[PDB]
Amino acid sequence: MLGFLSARQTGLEDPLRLRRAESTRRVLGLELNKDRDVERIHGGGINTLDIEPVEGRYMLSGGSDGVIVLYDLENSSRQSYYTCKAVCSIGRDHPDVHRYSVETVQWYPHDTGMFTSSSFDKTLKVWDTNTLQTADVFNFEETVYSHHMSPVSTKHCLVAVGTRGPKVQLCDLKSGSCSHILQGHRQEILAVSWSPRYDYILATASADSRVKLWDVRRASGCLITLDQHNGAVESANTAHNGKVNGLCFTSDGLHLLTVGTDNRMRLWNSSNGENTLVNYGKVCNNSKKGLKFTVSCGCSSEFVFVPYGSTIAVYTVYSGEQITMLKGHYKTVDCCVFQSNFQELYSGSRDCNILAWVPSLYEPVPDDDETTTKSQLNPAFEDAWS
């Protein structure tokens, strides 16, 4: 540390280096609930989490109960230990509440005043955050597994919806259009994800074992089908020997991660679909529904956090190296989300907990001359062989 501080003060190293090094060290030090609980509002499993992109203060949660909960993550108490309290909820008393489990919540990418929700009740809903009233509602023939709004598109406001139907659907919130379908897939579409680099490029994953990249401006059909063997454009390509149930672009958009029920994670070049041949080993993935997982941002290494049964596995994206297993939950983890500002990970599970994983690099320090106001050696940490 003191070396980094000296090098920064003297301009020997760019201020980038201390910042990225310490961010990486913090990710390596994640510990369960060290400073922080999250308030138990849900009665069911936590299907989905989304941290607000503007300030990172607020987290939406959706669950198998159909409830949507909005949490405040900032410690506005003066204590070193605190609870992330629920600001407000769309509970079962609300008229517009979802009838069946809520499978994706996403903030509007450009300000916090609106958010979107989807559910196995075959709806996509648009919510006014200040009032928690729906502004628009879209209905579908089939249960929605996933939806996404483009994180970078200013030009268009399209929601991609993946359903049990074989056709991807696109809803235009500006016009209210929901007629536009993409017709290339053959089974249920389990994950959809817009490129963070390009306004118009949508990745889609399906139980047909295919990941397809689309340019939604075109009348032409899809661009690229990912072939895990690298050899041919559509006739037989598969990304996994199983269902493909999760997508995550890397934070630069240059690669796409995919996870599937073959228990493998695979890294792809997003500009042409080449399998980069990074091998992570067995990544346990039994999930028959979409799996949400996340990369880090702003670290010296790009990490990926992936549900691994009841654990969260951490890998280095490019090296394939398994770094740690975060070992908290009692049932399968369904989502995790990364707070980029402070390198804190939140995780939802079918055990109904939301758990915070927080960098725990060192303890509060005593003064040895104190009587009892020290940083206490609690007797729970003591042996008792007598």
Binding site: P53, P109, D136, T154, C157, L173, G176
Partner: peptide, 25 residues
């Protein structure tokens, strides 16, 4: 307003206004 006070594009308030006007009378 607690939310929408800061931008990270169409502002939420105008997209919401279009959706409301489209769904009300």
């Amino acid at each position: 307003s607690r939310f929408g006070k800061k931008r990270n594009p169409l502002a939420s308030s105008s997209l919401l206004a279009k959706m409301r006007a489209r769904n009300h009378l």
